[PDB]
């Protein structure tokens, strides 16, 4: 039967799922690691024992334990990233995406969902790989890995809680897409794993982690690399973070052992209500529990791993959004509404400099507002919001994703960026957020194909591209097609630097995506707070 | 007679001369101090002892002793600033300007020129008052005072070398005016002093000094201000200097007795053949001797005396010109030639900005260069030409002036700001200098009304409107004419901030000249220079 696969961790029955008036395989749930729980919390993942009979895999599985956005109730704009299935502390599985007929040895690539290393499901509404498996005929995979203090918390130097756990566990299900996937009609020699927000942090993880290169082909990263500034701390500070947790519930900090057993013993609920309280800084776009450079993972810092070509040498596809930012102000700069025109006075786009960059002295903010500042206009509201708006961007997502497309470039093997700068038709939150973060993901998986979801004809036209580059890329290692009439999508060279805006009109190639501002963050502002 | 003037220090004999086909009297080579030769160098000057008979003033008088100019021989470009007469230690005279028929009680403008403290003359071709004292009817006075060593050597302490007695030189010609033009036709309670470079920059210091005060109405200052980072220096700079003067000339530095004696003793063109060995740094847009904070011609610091408002409170009407800094660039940063496009690549580029701005770490050499490179386009040989020439322009002149002004005008009476950009059709600089240093000056003093000195009309109708200006100015404190149908020249208030171009185009207002840059220039860098 087309629906029951044998792996070689022992049998699996899937489910046949319709799609665009037609219908392909679909195994959802398929256990990778045993479960983490008990004793195992914080613990390293280990290999699911193989087991009798036909694993029943055709429905979701759970979501990972992890904090639940609550900030608007009923909002389908925030819920739609929200855990749609039970948590539990059992949640290492994976879900595979057939086409019908099961192909021999074709393409696969691997979804590694993003989420601050905080949240993040694989079985939400606009991970569905179905819509893309079928059109561009791919195994599509999607992993989950633990978040939050449960994949991240870190007490370097024990065994108890190493860190990095989490990505530990992403590693895990692609030991299994490479052990396993051909029995699904997918050739391991040829997966593609592909990322968004701290997903495209991950994806860049492995591409600098020794033990992780060996099993992947390509990577797509997007809207996120490695080297952002909320996605990683030093052990020092994972350490502080480690302990100040346990200091909220009442633990006792003599000693590690000490402090690790009192945590297991705690309900997960309680560990997330508390989560937030550790952060260094009053600040946005910062995270509690994220991954860290401990030396095993990562062998040495990220910035030396970089400039020393120590990394995957291999073909990359990354881009970011145009407005990256917005989304984090709305939930913490004072000053915008999700109802409003959040117009921002001086006053609050100074507080929202300092919110943005935490680690910076009153020279630095100063900086940061000098280079963000129209002072032949210096009070006027909309000015204010889209510079308050572009710097939260800047710093955070797109300068540091430019240093890393650089940096790697020397060495690599074939670069293609992108500038995603189209606002959906239907998007329900306001205007003056624009081209979101996030949002770019229903292209990738081609949501607009399906009619009911209300997207215009271009937008659709859009997602089919999008699909066929993604896609093509996953393949052949370049977005474009060998004999293609269309128009080519420049590769990325350290000399030209050319990049394509991604939207519904005539593809328009650029060159060096926001410099200006790319220097002030990566050059100027790194060596002033070092000097001050 | 119309040529005989009986002042209080004796009687004058002048000289009737012919301007614009009509005639006006010429009363040249006033003196106003004793000759300051001999034990007297580097000593305040003294009130010049009234003389018998008549002295005869239909000559002009000898050019103070100066540095010479030589780096373009022929050059009308750069010798219509050389001194036109013999030079000698007996320097100060004044010349008089007067309508005919004698006025009872007009109007007085008195002009110091400029000339960067090391150099200028009364007697210079483009400063001849006669267009302007016939074309307005007023009486123009054209003062004198000592430069380089001879006017600003400072050991503070010591009576033998105060230092500023070149101020106190001009102070004394103002003196001087004010006790006798009322026998030239001149009323003594309506005087405006008006200057260039560094005489903008005196003029401004008149109006610091609480003696000098009382000597003048209105003031006006074109392309200088006394705050300017080469206009001053500290006691302790100028007694370095002035040691470092003595050790080049082989003089015993044992006591300021040793040193002045000796330099007392050396002719006038030794002192200045080692004048330029002295700066601290190699540089661009600095001077060897100039005024130096002494706690008396200057109470205290000139920033706080700007913050207390201890300064005289009366109108004032100053500008800029639109390429201040190419004049210094081309005499000395490396890159520029007086017969090429000058091009400059990045290499020269960054040498300029340490050439410019000498005083700087290597951080804020950072700081001036991301504020001022075009990231898209670094290697534009024509964009870091004028991006130089920007630098050393809002440096030196630009923003400095601007901080004077909103200072000022937070305590003053009226407040009048221009941006002089229009470049001359006769100037035989190359185009890359564009609207020069200083060469708004003709057009002040009305060298276009002369044909043969070939002006286009439309300049000519430029130098009258100016004329008109800074007249009408002299005599009400407004610019303007009180019923007329013109354009009007709006008032600068803290709130507004608007300025007028002066070119021969229809007037056009703005606001907050340069404010970009004038933030980076006095607010950023000095900040930034502090804390490292």
Tied chains: 1, 2.
Excluded at 227 to 248: D, F, H, I, Q, T
Aim: proline fraction near 6%; include cysteine; glycine fraction near 8%.
């Amino acid at each position: 039967s087309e629906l029951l696969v044998n792996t070689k961790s022992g049998k699996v029955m899937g489910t046949r799922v319709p799609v665009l008036s037609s219908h392909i395989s679909a195994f959802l749930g398929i256990p990778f690691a045993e479960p983490p729980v008990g004793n195992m919390r914080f613990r390293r993942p280990e290999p699911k024992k193989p087991w009798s009979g036909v694993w029943n895999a055709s429905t979701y599985p759970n979501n990972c334990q992890q904090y639940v956005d609550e900030q608007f109730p009923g909002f389908s704009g925030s819920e739609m990233w929200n855990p749609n299935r039970e948590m539990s502390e059992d949640c290492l599985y994976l879900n595979i995406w057939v086409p019908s007929p099961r192909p021999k040895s074709t393409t696969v690539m691997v979804w590694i969902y993003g989420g601050g290393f905080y949240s993040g499901s694989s079985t939400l509404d606009v991970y569905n790989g179905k819509y893309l498996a079928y059109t561009e005929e791919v195994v599509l995979v999607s992993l989950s890995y633990r978040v939050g203090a449960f994949g991240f918390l870190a007490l370097h130097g024990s065994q108890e809680a190493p860190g990095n756990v989490g990505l530990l566990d992403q590693r895990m299900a692609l030991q299994w897409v490479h052990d396993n996937i051909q029995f699904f009609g997918g050739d391991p020699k040829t997966v593609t794993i592909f990322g968004e927000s701290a997903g495209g942090a991950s994806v860049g993880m492995h591409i600098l982690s020794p033990g992780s290169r060996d099993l992947f082909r390509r990577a797509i990263l997007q809207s996120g690399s490695p080297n952002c500034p909320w996605a990683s701390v030093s052990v020092a500070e994972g350490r502080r973070r480690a302990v100040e947790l346990g200091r909220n519930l009442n633990c006792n900090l003599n000693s590690d052992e000490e402090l690790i057993h009192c945590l297991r013993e705690k309900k997960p609920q309680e560990l997330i209500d508390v989560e937030w309280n550790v952060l260094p800084f009053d600040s946005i776009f910062r995270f509690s529990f994220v991954p860290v450079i401990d030396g095993e993972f990562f062998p040495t810092s990220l910035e030396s791993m970089l400039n020393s070509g120590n990394f995957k040498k291999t073909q990359i596809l990354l881009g970011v959004n145009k407005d990256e930012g917005s989304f984090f102000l709305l939930y913490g700069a004072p000053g915008f509404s999700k109802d409003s025109e959040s117009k921002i006075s001086r006053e609050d786009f100074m507080s929202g400099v300092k919110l943005s960059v935490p680690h910076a002295n009153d020279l630095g903010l100063d900086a940061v507002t000098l280079q963000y500042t129209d002072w032949m206009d210096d009070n006027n509201g909309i000015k204010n919001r889209d510079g308050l708006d572009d710097i939260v961007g800047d710093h955070n997502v797109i300068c540091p994703l430019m240093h890393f497309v650089n940096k790697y470039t020397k060495f690599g093997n074939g670069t293609y960026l992108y500038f995603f700068n189209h606002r959906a038709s239907n998007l329900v939150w306001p205007e003056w957020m624009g081209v979101i973060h996030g949002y770019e993901i229903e292209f990738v998986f081609g949501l607009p194909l399906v009619k009911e979801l209300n997207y215009t004809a271009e937008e659709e036209a859009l997602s089919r591209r999008i699909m066929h580059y993604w896609a093509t890329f996953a393949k052949t290692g370049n977005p474009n097609e060998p004999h293609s009439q269309e128009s080519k999508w420049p590769l990325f060279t350290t000399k030209e630097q050319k990049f394509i805006d991604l939207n519904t009109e005539p593809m328009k190639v650029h060159q060096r995506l926001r410099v200006q501002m790319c220097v002030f963050w990566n050059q100027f502002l790194p060596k002033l707070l070092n000097a001050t």
